[PDB]
Symmetry: C3
Amino acid sequence: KYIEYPVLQKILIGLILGAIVGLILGHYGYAHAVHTYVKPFGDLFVRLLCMLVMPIVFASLVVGAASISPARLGRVGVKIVVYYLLTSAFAVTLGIIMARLFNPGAGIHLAVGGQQFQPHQAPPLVHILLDIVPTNPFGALANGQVLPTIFFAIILGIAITYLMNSENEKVRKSAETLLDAINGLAEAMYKIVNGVMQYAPIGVFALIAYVMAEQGVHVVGELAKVTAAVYVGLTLQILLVYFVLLKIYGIDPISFIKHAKDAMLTAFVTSSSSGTLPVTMRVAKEMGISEGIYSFTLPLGATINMDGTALYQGVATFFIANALGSHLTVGQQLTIVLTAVLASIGTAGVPGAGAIMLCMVLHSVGLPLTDPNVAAAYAMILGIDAILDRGRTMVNVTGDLTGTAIVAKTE
Amino acid sequence: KYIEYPVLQKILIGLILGAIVGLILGHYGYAHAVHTYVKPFGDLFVRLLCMLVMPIVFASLVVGAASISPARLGRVGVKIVVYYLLTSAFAVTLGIIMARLFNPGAGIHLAVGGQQFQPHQAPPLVHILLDIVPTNPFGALANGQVLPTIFFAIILGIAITYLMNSENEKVRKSAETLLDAINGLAEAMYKIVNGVMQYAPIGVFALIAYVMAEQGVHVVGELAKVTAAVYVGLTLQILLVYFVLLKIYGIDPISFIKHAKDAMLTAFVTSSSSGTLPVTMRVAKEMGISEGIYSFTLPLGATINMDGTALYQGVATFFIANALGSHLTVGQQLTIVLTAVLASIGTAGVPGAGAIMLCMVLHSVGLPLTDPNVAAAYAMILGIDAILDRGRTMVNVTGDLTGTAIVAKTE
Amino acid sequence: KYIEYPVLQKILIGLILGAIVGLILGHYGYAHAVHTYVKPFGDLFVRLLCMLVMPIVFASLVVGAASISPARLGRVGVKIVVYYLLTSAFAVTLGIIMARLFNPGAGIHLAVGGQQFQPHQAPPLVHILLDIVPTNPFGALANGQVLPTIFFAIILGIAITYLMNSENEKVRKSAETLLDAINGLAEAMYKIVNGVMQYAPIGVFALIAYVMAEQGVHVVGELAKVTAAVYVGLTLQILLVYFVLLKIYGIDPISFIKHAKDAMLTAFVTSSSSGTLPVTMRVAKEMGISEGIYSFTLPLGATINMDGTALYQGVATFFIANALGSHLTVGQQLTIVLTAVLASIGTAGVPGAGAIMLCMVLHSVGLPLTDPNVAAAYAMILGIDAILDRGRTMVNVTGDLTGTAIVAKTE
Ligand SMILES: N[C@@H](CC(=O)O)C(=O)O
Ligand SMILES: N[C@@H](CC(=O)O)C(=O)O
Ligand SMILES: N[C@@H](CC(=O)O)C(=O)O
Ligand code: NA
Ligand code: NA
Ligand code: NA
Ligand code: NA
Ligand code: NA
Ligand code: NA
């Protein structure tokens, strides 16, 4: 098969090349030949992605919850946890504000079938709150229904950790083997993630080629406007979150960045925050950080605290909804700030990662990707994912080193 | 949050306090204000309970089945197992007879929506027997359908133990790893049980507060009549089961009870038969029981043979059905004696425990808690659970010490 | 219960005895007393079998996929794997040709309820290909839907093995515990297989007794015609596959068979390819095979490469379809060759085994066992399973030793 190129560029080749192949078929031989012979491969891609969502949403958050489960962390760790959380929970809100001064999508509106998308009425507040609790975890998990799966997963991991403290040894052992299996379910799903990302050049080619064949040249303006909102969201994250909470603790932010240079760029290119752990810890020592702290937080911030992804997912959600012509009620809107945090925690730190967990923040707020409108819109961001992914990863790692430095000053 | 009180009293505070708050709103401001702002919290409680049912029904009985799976028990254990079973199977039957000379519920009848509850016709005997076998374990387990889940679980655990006897070591190896995960699934669910029981003060408050707000003071008579049927069932259990099968084997029952004093009272207050194992074994030695016998049976009787719970579940089932105006056919009636035994086996030995497993003996015999009538009735018993749980636990432990004594005499 | 006889004969007693009991009730006291009092036990049997299908289809193929998962096998193994596959993929195709020059079924036509079976239209090619990918593995697995379950299972096991190669040791470990759990799920399901095969004498008795009571005697002609197609398919397999690819590599096939004597007959009688592994390796040395080769391939060919089962399954599928009056389109027909290979890989190597995986190759090609027509036909093959199983097993083992010999010559 000989297909050995570096996935990042590889995909970008799919993206640019497929874009041109889309536009030149915008005129000339009509897009209907694309939708018949090109779209299928893109659909295969999308299917393989919103395939992984449910397993990784479950196991990932049983792990993640076990990773934060109080009490199962030194008071050094409570600090870095709370920091990590409020950095994701601010970063997503920022992504909303970027989705406010920018309207990504708005002006691209589509109805696929001459049938515009319309949301089902939100049940009573009582019934939606009660509905986050599953009635039969197996059931809820089985057929979509993401939020119950979340709640159960978190509850599970947390309980598991409290099994590991038990007097009995059969009990603690059992907790170990189980949690250890759930982890590994997740990790295997991430191996699958990578495997799909090898198909990403083709799938992207087909998706953006199809989207370019239709919709004319509207999309480029919008997609670039989204990339705008995202990145200027990220650097606003850095210059307003990190640079501000660095001076408050007496850290020189400039030199901080000069030390983080290698880790930030390495994450920027590899886009595997987990694969950019050795360089992040090399940068950990290089700036005088205690062994016992950077050995604890950086491998936690590897999988937890990906606040750049939280931002990305907020922005992406507003792009989807605006592309469909829906206005996001200030209840699902804060269900974004709430959800994209947990989706950030669940995100792998791998080339694909956050886009898959986008499915999760979209199965919430009622935008199922079984609906043609949504699936079509999701495919668009998914096409330009390769672009956003790099800087997003960069901010995911910048968060880790930042938090480590702040908790390090106080201990 | 500061909420640190002892859960038992804590809950009793919720129960009494919420009762009064119910009755004073029985007059005055109509109950409709309760149902809007108070009932939601109780509903959250009930949902959290009938949530755990399916996972614990599966894993719990895979465990339990492995715990009794012949041949994986010494003939020292065969005796104590047979005893345990016939004690649960008599105790439930006794609970039915207590639900015969007492009619708990009967005279409380309700139709919630002015629509009285009515059972779907019982299919052919052939088809109901065949239906205990699931057609696709995953499916049956997933969306309710309790009995198949049981049969599969039991078959599974039993098979697992026969893997542990296999010549091969990869086989006998893996066989544990599973069983060890399934256990731990169960045990984690019990940690969750505890966690919900920390919400129990509120949920109970809301439930009996709502029930008192409507239904007037009818309920107090009935609920107390149920408590009656239960407890006099328990003491009839002791004085007719235990006291008789103690004299048949030459044990002095009076002094027996004086030794069991500490264990029975400890169980009575902690209401955690599992948490009352150290005192049960202290009382085991204190009355001259062999190390090799009381080290085997008492930690089995901790989770298995909770025949006071079996009685409770018989009575409770008749309370539910009688509260709805349904008469229990002597076909579902013996499905109670058959089921509530298995539900006793699956019960944890934890504060909540049996209250959750009622869901199981009610998804059997066809009283799903998805039907408003049933959920309303279940909420009532569920409110006064804290009361019955104590003496019930007491009988669960008294059974354990009794059986240990008899198998010890014969060995 | 005293039921201790050797299962093989035992079942044949059920088969012959029940056959006569069927025909004498063909006249005389009409079959309706059978269908009322005899059929239920057969139905119980069938339910217990198509029960195991989904768990073993999942776990079996996660294991099985891990068993072949490249790269985690030496190039010594690549050879024997490719051989194993193309032997199964030729053997099933041969079973189709045997189902062509014989028309088994055709002329037995039945509509059980005076309603002949008719297939739902096959969706677009695009949509069936996309549909092999599951949308929510949990869901697809839960309610039937075989092929998605397969695709996910294979992807999973393969990914798991790539976890076992990971730099990290927590990862490497977790992968082990998980994969190790899925194995053991499968193996336990095979213990259940055996246990059901202890009920086989009765269930078979009831099945062929019912089938003989109706349909007159024409069934005997058809069933024996199936046995014909099967066995002469097997010996055509040997004399055209094995004997030819033995001469191509300079192996003396006659003496080869004289050495394989003990293994072939032992497999023929025990019908447990897995239980006939020690004798297969005894014959491995007895004909001068390298320790490092026959210790690797023969324990793989135990569970993988059961090409006699693949043939059996092709023939059985054509028997079903022809018994219903359906002609197998050359697309589901090659879905047979594609599927029955995987079902062969998943097959246990146990007395029951392949018949259960027949459920799988029948939920593919769209012949679900929820439709009475199919279930009635499947029950027929299932009745005469005991006969085909022996020679089938024999060919399953002959394939293993053959492959071992050839790869041994080339290395
Ligand atoms: N690739 C990002 C995560 C994402 O794509 O959302 C990371 O490595 O952190
Ligand atoms: N709590 C009881 C069981 C139950 O609540 O049903 C025990 O410890 O035995
Ligand atoms: N019994 C066969 C498998 C089957 O029945 O399909 C074997 O041992 O290989
Ligand atoms: Na994450
Ligand atoms: Na991060
Ligand atoms: Na038990
Ligand atoms: Na007990
Ligand atoms: Na197989
Ligand atoms: Na074989």
